[PDB]
C-alpha cells in the first residue's frame, strides 16, 4: 500500500533534502509491503492563507503526518500555530522540529503535537544541577510575566521543594517594560548574591543596561542566564562572565529532518502490523468526522525508541518532548562566547578551562554576605 506523509518547510532546498531522506529511508528497511511518499509546501505571511493552503495540502493527499519549521522568524511564535489547529481537528499527528515556545506543551489546547527539541521550560534542570554541584544555596530569581516566563517559576519550585530549600524573593516585571530600576533596587538590600534571569531578547537588553547604573555587575556578584537571554540585540550589552548556556545542535534545521522520518517510519511499520487502520479523511470540505484511529497512532508513536540519531538518542516523555538532550555551557570573556563544559542528560561535566567570574576574580565567589546591619 502507498503510505503518504507530508510536510511544510521554508527554502525548497530542504524540501529536496527531505525527499532524499525519505528515499534513503525507503532503501533502508523498505520492502514490497508498503511504500512511502512526500509532499511539501512553503510559508506565507497571512496565517489564514496558510490554513487554507494546509487544507489544500491535505485534500491533495491522505496525509498520515506533518512536519513544520520556522527558519524565517518575524514571529517566532505565530508561525507553527495554524497548522496545529487545522490538523488537530482531525487528530492528524503533527510533528514540530524547531520551535521552543512553552505554550505548545499544554495538551488541552493543541490536541496532538510533538517535538524533537526540549522547550525553554526544561532549561532550569541544568540551573538546579549547577546549584547542587557548585554549592550555591541562596538564589534570587527574576522572571517576566508572560506564560513562557511563568512556566519556569513552577518548574524551579517543584524541583526545589523536593529538598525543601525554598528559594527567596522571586521578582516579576511586566514585558516590553523599560525603567526596571524601580524593581532592581528592591533586590539591592537582599542577602543573596546570585541572580537568575529568564526573559526575552528585548527585555534582557534593558535590565543589562539598567544594572549598569546600579552597579551590581561588579565583583562578588555572579549570575547565569538562559539561551534567549544572550545571542540577540542584548549580547552587545552583556557584562562579561555571565555563565549562560546553549543547545548542542539546535537551529540546524537539517539534522532534524533526518531524525524525524527515522522515528516516523519506524512507527508506521510497528503500527500496520495490526487491526483496522482504515484511512484519514481525504478533503477538508465534505467531512466532519475525526480519523477514528488518530489517537492510536499517537499512542504508539509516543514510545518509539530510535538508535542511530544524528542528533543522538531520541525518545519522548509523557507530555511529548525530546527527553535527555545536550546542553553546552558558555562563558563570556572579552566579548566572545567560549565553552566551559557540557551538560549530558542528568549530570554536568566540565573540563580544561578556568572560569572567569564577572569581577575578574579567579576563585569561586560564594553568595550570601550576611548583612551586619539590622532592621
Amino acid at each position: 500500500k502507498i503510505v503518504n506523509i507530508g510536510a511544510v518547510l521554508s527554502t525548497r532546498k530542504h524540501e529536496q533534502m527531505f525527499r532524499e531522506a525519505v528515499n534513503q529511508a525507503n532503501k533502508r528497511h523498505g520492502s514490497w509491503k508498503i511504500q512511502l511518499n512526500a509532499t511539501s509546501v512553503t510559508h506565507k505571511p497571512n496565517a489564514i492563507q496558510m490554513a487554507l493552503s494546509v487544507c489544500e495540502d491535505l485534500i491533495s493527499s491522505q496525509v498520515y503526518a506533518i512536519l513544520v519549521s520556522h527558519p524565517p522568524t518575524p514571529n517566532d511564535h505565530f508561525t507553527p500555530t495554524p497548522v496545529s489547529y487545522t490538523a488537530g481537528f482531525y487528530r492528524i499527528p503533527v510533528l514540530g522540529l524547531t520551535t521552543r515556545m512553552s505554550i505548545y506543551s499544554d495538551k488541552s489546547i493543541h490536541l496532538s503535537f510533538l517535538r524533537t527539541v526540549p522547550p525553554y521550560s526544561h532549561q532550569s534542570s541544568v540551573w538546579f544541577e549547577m546549584m547542587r554541584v557548585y554549592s550555591w544555596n541562596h538564589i534570587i530569581l527574576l522572571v517576566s510575566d508572560d506564560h513562557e516566563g511563568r512556566a519556569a517559576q513552577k518548574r524551579l519550585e517543584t524541583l526545589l521543594e523536593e529538598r525543601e530549600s525554598k528559594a527567596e524573593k522571586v521578582l516579576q516585571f511586566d514585558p516590553g517594560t523599560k525603567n526596571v530600576t524601580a524593581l532592581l533596587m528592591e533586590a539591592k538590600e537582599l542577602e543573596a548574591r546570585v541572580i537568575i534571569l529568564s526573559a526575552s531578547e528585548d527585555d534582557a537588553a534593558t535590565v543589562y543596561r539598567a544594572a549598569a547604573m546600579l552597579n551590581m555587575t561588579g565583583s562578588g556578584y555572579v549570575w547565569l542566564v538562559g539561551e534567549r537571554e544572550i545571542s540577540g540585540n542584548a549580547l552587545r550589552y552583556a557584562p562579561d562572565g555571565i555563565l549562560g548556556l546553549q543547545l548542542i545542535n539546535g537551529k540546524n534545521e537539517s539534522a532534524h529532518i533526518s531524525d524525524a522520518v527515522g522515528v516516523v517510519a519506524q512507527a508506521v511499520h510497528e503500527l500496520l502490523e495490526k487491526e483496522n487502520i482504515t484511512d484519514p479523511p481525504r478533503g477538508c470540505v465534505g467531512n466532519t468526522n475525526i480519523w477514528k484511529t488518530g489517537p492510536l497512532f499517537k499512542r504508539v508513536l509516543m514510545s518509539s525508541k530510535y538508535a542511530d540519531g544524528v542528533t543522538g538518542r531520541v525518545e519522548f516523555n509523557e507530555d511529548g518532548d525530546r527527553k535527555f538532550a545536550n546542553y553546552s555551557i558558555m562563558n563570556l570573556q572579552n566579548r566572545k562566547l567560549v565553552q566551559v563544559g557540557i551538560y549530558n542528560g542528568t549530570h554536568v561535566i566540565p573540563n580544561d578551562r578556568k572560569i572567569i567570574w564577572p569581577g575578574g576574580e579567579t576563585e569561586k565567589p560564594r553568595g550570601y554576605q550576611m548583612s551586619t546591619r539590622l532592621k
Binding site: 497571512n46 496565517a47 489564514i48 492563507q49 490554513a51 487554507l52 487544507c55 500555530t81 495554524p82 489547529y85 487545522t86 488537530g88 481537528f89 505554550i103 499544554d106 495538551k107 488541552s108 489546547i109 490536541l111 508572560d146 506564560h147 477538508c284 470540505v285 465534505g286 467531512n287 466532519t288 489517537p295 492510536l296
Partner: protein, 379 residues
C-alpha cells in the same frame, strides 16, 4: 452592526427566516439591524472560508455564535480567527461553551460558561450539606485532568471539614482497553460517594463497568461536572438514576431566546460606550488583507464590554473570558429519566429542595432507611 452564525441544526430555517426581518426586534438603544449567515457541515475548511469573507462585505462590529454539542476542536478555531481580524466575538451554545484556559495574548473570544473550579466550588457545598464527607475520585486520562485533579486538593484545603478522601483512580476507558485491569481497580473499592470526571463517550464505557462490579445501587451516589452529561435532554442508557451535575442558569431555554440574550450584550455594551466615551466606537475588521499589527482603540472598547447587567442578571466577565459569579443551578436524574431542577445557587448561599436525598432502588419503590426521624420544635 451585529452578525449571527448558525453552525448546527435539524432544519430550523423557520427560526432562521424568523430572524431575517426583525431589524426592529429588540428594545435595546442602537442600530440592532442584524445581518446573518449559515453553515452546513461545520469544519475548518468552510468555517474559515465564510467568516472573514463576510468581514469584507461589511464592517459589522462583532459576531455571535451557536452550534451543536460533542464537537470540541471548534473551540480554538474561533479564538484563532478573532486573534487576527481583531473583532470581538461571543459564543452561546453547547460546543464552544467549555472554557479554554489560556487564550491567545491579544484575542477577544468572550466565552459564555464556567470554569472547572467554579463547579467544584458548588459540588463541595452539596457534598457537605448532607455531610457525606468521604469520597473517592475517578478520572480517565482525558486532556485536562491534571488541571481538575489540582482542583479538589486545593479546594479541600480552603474549607473547614476533615474531607477524608480515601483514594484516587486512573484508568483508560476508550473504545479499546483491558476491562479486567479496570475491573481490578474498580471491584477493589469501598466508598459512599464518587466524584467522577470523564467525557460522554467515556461515560457509557464507565457506567457500564459499574453495574457488574456492584457500584450503582442505592448504597452509592455519583457526581460529575458539566462535561459528562448528554446533550441536555435525552440521557442515554446506563446513566444511573440519581446522578448529580451542576449546570449554568440558561440550562433550559429556546435557541431563539439565547440569541436575544446574546445580542443584548453587544448592544448594552455599545450604547454604554456612547454615553461615556462617545459616538459608536470604530467598528471594523479586515480579513487576510494586512490584518492586525496592533490595536490602540478597539482594545479600549473591550473593557466597556466586560461589565454588563440586563433584565436583572449579572454577566461580568474575567480576563480569562469566562463568567464570574453566575447564578448556577443543580440538576439530578429522577425516576422518569429526566432532569429536574433540584437547587439554585444564588449569590453565595446554596439553597436546596430535598432535606434528605431520596435514595432509589433497583426497581423504583424508594427506600427510606428505618433509623431516621423528623423533629418539630419552636422558639
Amino acid at each position: 452592526t451585529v452578525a449571527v452564525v448558525f453552525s448546527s441544526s435539524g432544519p430550523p430555517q423557520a427560526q432562521f427566516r424568523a430572524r431575517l426581518t426583525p431589524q426592529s426586534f429588540l428594545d435595546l438603544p442602537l442600530e440592532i439591524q442584524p445581518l446573518t449567515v449559515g453553515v452546513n457541515t461545520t469544519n475548518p475548511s468552510s468555517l474559515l472560508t465564510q467568516i472573514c469573507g463576510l468581514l469584507g462585505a461589511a464592517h459589522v462590529h462583532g459576531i455571535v455564535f451557536e452550534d451543536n454539542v460533542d464537537t470540541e476542536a471548534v473551540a480554538q478555531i474561533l479564538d484563532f480567527i478573532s486573534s487576527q481580524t481583531h473583532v470581538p466575538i461571543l459564543s452561546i451554545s453547547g460546543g464552544s461553551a467549555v472554557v479554554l484556559t489560556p487564550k491567545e495574548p491579544g484575542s477577544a473570544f468572550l466565552q459564555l460558561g464556567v470554569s472547572l473550579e467554579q463547579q467544584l466550588q458548588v459540588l463541595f457545598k452539596v457534598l457537605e450539606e448532607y455531610d457525606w464527607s468521604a469520597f473517592a475520585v475517578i478520572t480517565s486520562l482525558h486532556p485536562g485532568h491534571a488541571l481538575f485533579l489540582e482542583g479538589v486538593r486545593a479546594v479541600a484545603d480552603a474549607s473547614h471539614v476533615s474531607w477524608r478522601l480515601l483514594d484516587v483512580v486512573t484508568l483508560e476507558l476508550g473504545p479499546g482497553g483491558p476491562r479486567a485491569r479496570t475491573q481490578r481497580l474498580l471491584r477493589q473499592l469501598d466508598a459512599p460517594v464518587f466524584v467522577a470526571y470523564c467525557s460522554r463517550e467515556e461515560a457509557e464505557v464507565l457506567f457500564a463497568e459499574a453495574a457488574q462490579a456492584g457500584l450503582v445501587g442505592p448504597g452509592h451516589v455519583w457526581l460529575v461536572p458539566n462535561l459528562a452529561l448528554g446533550s441536555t435532554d435525552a440521557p442515554p442508557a446506563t446513566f444511573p438514576v440519581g446522578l448529580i451535575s451542576v449546570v449554568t442558569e440558561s440550562w433550559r431555554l429556546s435557541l431563539r431566546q439565547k440569541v436575544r440574550d446574546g445580542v443584548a450584550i453587544l448592544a448594552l455594551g455599545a450604547h454604554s460606550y456612547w454615553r461615556q466615551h462617545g459616538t459608536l466606537p470604530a467598528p471594523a475588521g479586515d480579513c487576510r488583507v494586512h490584518p492586525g499589527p496592533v490595536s490602540p482603540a478597539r482594545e479600549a472598547f473591550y473593557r466597556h464590554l466586560l461589565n454588563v447587567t440586563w433584565e436583572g442578571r449579572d454577566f461580568s466577565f474575567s480576563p480569562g473570558g469566562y463568567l464570574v459569579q453566575p447564578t448556577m443551578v443543580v440538576i439530578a436524574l429522577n425516576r422518569h429519566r429526566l432532569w429536574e431542577m433540584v437547587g439554585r445557587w444564588e449569590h453565595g448561599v446554596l439553597y436546596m429542595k430535598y432535606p434528605v436525598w431520596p435514595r432509589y432502588s433497583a426497581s423504583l419503590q424508594p427506600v427510606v432507611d428505618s433509623r431516621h426521624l423528623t423533629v418539630a420544635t419552636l422558639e
